[PDB]
């Protein structure tokens with residue numbers, strides 16, 4: 001050993017550590033860790049395989065030998081056998097491996113180090129450490145140690161006096177060293193691509209109408225990285241017709257059950273929102289959760305629905321239909337969601353209504369009407385403009401339409417965030433300079449709002465992915481600021497030229 005890449009001392013957060021086993025419970029407790037410091041208790045284990053795990057792919061590379069060390073303690077009777085296991089996904093064979101790397105006998109009531117050296121295959125990713133015993137005993141652990149032998153020309157700094165500049169992390173991108181360096185260098189906001197959606201956070205087993213179980217396990221390594229590096233997080237998303245398990249809307253908590261009543265759904269909705277915010281605060285209190293998309297994409301693209309049905313999607317599940325409309329009949333669930341979120345959200349977490357095609361007249365007018373109403377009721381802080389646009393200065397998402405919409409939302413009096421900006425080349429139909437021109441147009445439009453008007457502000461501009469190898473549109477649409485090799489594109493240098501150097505600030509402390 002020689003160089004330390006991880007040291008988890010649960011002094012503030014849960015440090016990326018997660019319950020292994022659906023009913024296992026983790027709780028970090030002052031004074032009860034190692035050397036009288038804060039430690040992680042693991043309780044309610046009901047078999048030997050239950051315990052705790054942490055995905056360390058942000059820190060650990062395949063092919064490198066690491067010394068893993070953990071201090072453990074139990075308060076059972078006699079000796080307990082602790083085990084450290086390392087698991088990983090082999091990125092070539094697509095196959096997972098798991099191995100006990102250390103076994104250690106631990107007497108009751110004594111802090112004991114368990115450690116071993118382990119080198120994963122060079123193709124290993126998602127390197128994950130876990131701690132169990134050969135029993136169901138409660139334990140405490142601490143000091144997870146893993147060892148090995150004004151103002152810069154970066155987006156966050158350039159825009160420091162204007163807005164946060166954000167990107168997106170997901171379960172795969174966590175492991176990419178190059179992406180990690182990129183995020184640390186350029187971006188002061190992160191949204192989880194999928195890991196905070198209801199289907200990633202809802203826990204079916206043991207959920208009841210008034211106590212919906214949630215888990216941050218899918219998002220833990222991202223929240224932990226952001227909290228540790230002073231990167232603010234936008235929560236995404238509390239309510240959406242998509243990526244939400246069908247069972248959440250059914251009487252027996254099964255996909256195949258009967259649709260619940262509105263009053264049962266109100267309980268489940270409030271419980272989910274309440275427990276999401278409670279868990280974020282419990283596990284990652286030092287995280288700057290600066291925004292949350294409370295309701296996502298509830299307005300129909302169909303002009304007939306915006307005209308005659310208050311913008312409600314068609315009721316149902318899948319094909320763009322809404323299980324929320326299925327239960328509530330109506331977009332009435334939107335105000336309910338904001339009401340609950342307002343009750344449970346931290347004071348500094350700004351509440352957003354988030355939507356795409358938000359510059360399309362019929363849809364834009366409907367979005368603006370919903371948000372104006374929520375805003376004036378004190379329930380909403382801003383409109384999220386998803387900005388899934390193409391590289392054309394003209395047309396459907398052209399600069400004229402885009403600015404009209406930006407201005408119209410700003411004119412409500414609320415703030416705006418550009419939340420999921422990507423700029424499709426449409427399979428090579430558009431040039432990279434055309435793309436650069438759209439990016440610059442969008443960033444300039446937001447800068448103009450902030451220098452003008454003033455009342456409402458653009459408080460974040462976020463792109464939906466880090467580079468072209470990691471976009472939900474497919475790489476053939478080459479939609480982002482960095483290419484597949486993580487090199488800056490013409491769009492990056494165009495966006496990097498909008499703010500004069502005299503105006504750059506501390507991106508880690510934006511205005």
Ligand SMILES: O[C@@H]1[C@@H](O)[C@H](O[C@@H]2CO[C@@H](O[C@@H]3CO[C@@H](O)[C@H](O)[C@H]3O)[C@H](O)[C@H]2O)OC[C@H]1O
Nearest residue numbers: 193194236296297354355356386420464471472
């Ligand atoms: O098969 C599943 C995929 O379809 C899923 O892809 C994600 C779908 O959501 C994408 O983000 C949304 C883009 O549209 C906006 O309206 C929403 O606000 C966004 O959440 C995300 O980028 C894709 O990765 O991934 C999970 C798979 O199981």
